[PDB]
């Protein structure tokens, strides 16, 4: 109707105003500023440990806060806790549902979370007098499959699903404290800030969004992609993030200046991107592709510095330890690898 | 070199490895089937006859089946369809008693064309190059009752036939089967079922036996 047309025109002219404001604040590009810096030499990393025991595809993996323990998730119905130093096994948890796409490790070290294709997020308690791992809480309030889950503390969790909505939960009660809405398509990845006051989330409508955990509404929105968004992660500083799509391209965004800074693409790459992570100093950007090998990029010069090629299938998960000492990689060949 | 506790830790690791290997050899004793459909295509009737995500277990002639129904997902399909990459077979359902009905969202498109589009999407997927498809055509009695009152030209305006039950059924089956584009690596099985039957389990049993024999031949290098 007439009201709909006038409101659409209003939205269009707000969009024009926002575009003009974004264009006004762009004085220079990152390429000129970083031209004079000394490039990072070619980096060689070698497989220190190899992990065996999975009999299916490996989808999730998350480090711990002590930089020695990690958890791995596969569709064999098993969640395995490893010891990277001695290549032992501490716990093997059977799962009720074998369709898992995410896993998370509590910062304290007492709980572990998992879920997928069941619209339920399960919490497992490790430290028990009885001597076994038991279920502690099941969160079932979503409509689509869960894509990612992360811990804020021992009594708070944040979840993203394919029902276009994200949620904040309370473990002791089991009810959604806040619900974040505003996207258009599936939500695939979310990243928490180190200061735990904000979090970013990427969606399948080629858009990334910032959300405030406490108040409960979107702050900023970012566009610029051409296909789905698969991975997202925060810079160590907390004023930037990097995102990866299905069109063989990565981009870096800032929070204070709502603009796109640098893009990572190469002509020889025509495959997708699955996982993205940084280093401890924020100088290296590790990416996993569909072409069976991972790449390392210089986060400020967009120059390839090395390739980790030791897998036979797609790389599905990638992580970096808190101490910044090792890199963990997983794949569909049922093998984990620590690189150093 | 190891301490008095490192030896016990390594023993625990060996026990966990043994349990994992023992449990992994029992999951290959199971035959996995994935079921697809279009909502009103007669899914529930076959689920109740042959006995987020629904999982069903049943046994027939010493063969154990694990059936996955994922019709209640309502999300983007190409973000979770690679999970079922190594399933034994796909059970597809088409309601051919819906050639006259029209979609609720749009009055221009009918349900049969939607089913054909979804079948074309599933059959020519990159994750199902060598996966068998068992096609069930549902509600034939209602179709034979409806075909006399109303012609079948609405669904297929390029059809010239006797306008009887057998010719219409054969035409529908042929039109569905020409959608395949491999015809050498993949095999398609078609069957006509109504509300009351007793032979569907035998059909799926024969299909899965053929698939098992083919896989065994391929494993040994004799195929």
């Amino acid at each position, epitope marked *: 109707g007439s009201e709909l047309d006038q409101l659409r025109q209003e939205a269009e002219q707000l969009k024009n105003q926002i575009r003009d404001a974004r264009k006004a604040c762009a004085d220079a590009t990152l390429s000129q500023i970083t031209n004079n810096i000394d490039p990072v030499g070619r980096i060689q990393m070698r497989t220190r440990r190899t992990l065996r025991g999975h009999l299916a595809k490996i989808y999730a993996m998350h480090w711990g806060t002590d930089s020695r323990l990690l958890v791995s998730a596969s569709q064999d119905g098993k969640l395995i806790i490893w010891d990277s130093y001695t290549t032992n096994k501490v716990h093997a948890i059977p799962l009720r549902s074998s369709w898992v796409m995410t896993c998370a490790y509590a910062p304290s070290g007492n709980y572990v979370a998992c879920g997928g294709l069941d619209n339920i997020c399960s919490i497992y308690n490790l430290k028990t007098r009885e*001597g076994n791992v038991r279920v502690s809480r099941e969160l079932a309030g979503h409509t689509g499959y869960l894509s990612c889950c992360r811990f804020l503390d021992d009594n708070q969790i944040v979840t993203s699903s394919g029902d276009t909505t994200c949620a904040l939960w309370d473990i002791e009660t089991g009810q959604q404290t806040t619900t974040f809405t505003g996207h258009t398509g599936d939500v695939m990845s979310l990243s928490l800030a180190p200061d735990t006051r904000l979090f970013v989330s990427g969606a399948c409508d080629a858009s990334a969004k910032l959300w405030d955990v406490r108040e409960g509404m979107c702050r900023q929105t970012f566009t610029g992609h051409e296909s789905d968004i698969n991975a997202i992660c925060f810079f160590p500083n907390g004023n930037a993030f990097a995102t990866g799509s299905d069109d063989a391209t990565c981009r870096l965004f800032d929070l204070r200046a709502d603009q796109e800074l640098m893009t990572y693409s190469h002509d020889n790459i025509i495959c997708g991107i699955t996982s993205v992570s940084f280093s401890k100093s924020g100088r290296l950007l590790l990416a996993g592709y569909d072409d069976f090998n991972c790449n390392v990029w210089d986060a400020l010069k967009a120059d390839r510095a090395g390739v980790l090629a030791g897998h036979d299938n797609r790389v599905s998960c990638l992580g970096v330890t808190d101490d910044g000492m090792a890199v963990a990689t997983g794949s569909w060949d049922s093998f984990l690898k620590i690189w150093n | 070199t190891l*301490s008095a506790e490192d030896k016990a830790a390594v023993e625990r690791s060996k026990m966990i490895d043994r349990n994992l290997r023992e449990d992994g050899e029992k999951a290959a004793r199971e035959v996995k089937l994935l079921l697809l459909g279009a909502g009103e295509s007669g899914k529930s009737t076959i689920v109740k006859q042959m006995k987020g995500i629904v999982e069903t277990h049943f046994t027939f002639k010493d063969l154990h089946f694990k059936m996955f129904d994922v019709g209640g997902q309502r999300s983007e399909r190409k973000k979770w369809i690679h999970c079922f990459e190594g399933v034994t077979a796909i059970i597809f359902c088409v309601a051919l008693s819906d050639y006259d009905l029209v979609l609720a969202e749009d009055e221009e498109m009918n349900r049969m064309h939607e089913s054909m589009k979804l079948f074309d999407s599933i059959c020519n997927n990159k994750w199902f190059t060598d996966t068998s498809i068992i096609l069930f055509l549902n509600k034939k009695d209602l179709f034979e009752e409806k075909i006399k009152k109303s012609p079948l030209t609405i669904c297929y305006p390029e059809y010239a036939g006797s306008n009887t039950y057998e010719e219409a059924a054969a035409y529908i089956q042929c039109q569905f089967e020409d959608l395949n584009k491999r015809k050498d690596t993949k095999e398609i099985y078609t069957h006509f079922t109504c509300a009351t039957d007793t032979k569907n389990v035998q059909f799926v049993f024969d299909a899965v036996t053929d698939v098992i024999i083919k896989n065994n031949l391929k494993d040994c290098g004799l195929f």
Partner: single-chain antibody
Amino acid sequence: VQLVESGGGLVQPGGSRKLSCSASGFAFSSFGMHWVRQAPEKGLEWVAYISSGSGTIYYADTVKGRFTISRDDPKNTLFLQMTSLRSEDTAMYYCVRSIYYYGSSPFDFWGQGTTLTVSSDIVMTQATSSVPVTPGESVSISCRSSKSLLHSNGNTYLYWFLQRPGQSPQLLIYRMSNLASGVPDRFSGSGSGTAFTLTISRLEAEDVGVYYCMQHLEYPLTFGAGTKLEL
């Protein structure tokens, strides 16, 4: 969680019995099991050890070849078989559970004890034998070894446990730096190399008893003489 054992009666200088303990409240199949012997009005020493899966079995030199150990997982019961009892094997026996992985706390539950009456190795030395104390003040106890307990992996295997009059021992500190579960934050431990110390900041009426220090580098497990703390 509890462990109840029985089977301790009077014996002649020539004879045989067998002791049995039943667990209830935890997963028996994932716990290794021990036996500890304490002479009347004396200290306590180790007897044997059985691991999970019945793969590793260790005995003591003093009683090697004369006793038998056996475990039944489906019925959740541990046995001990006596063949020919001498006159020095008159004491009270205790049963202990332990689990070994990264971050575990072995020797966590001690259960109760049963009485049996008849008719190289690293030595733990605690010079002190009795200390009077007034509630509300700090206490410090020292335990000395004959070899450095620090292993190259970074772990130092020392264990501190308490014994009240008419009760069973309870774990306080394992690996001489970590505090157990279910105990107040008053106790603390420290030490380096050959000498180690345990400190209590504030003393109350429940801290009276005898304390022990135990080592775990290599078998057999050797305990030290108790350090009584009277009111």
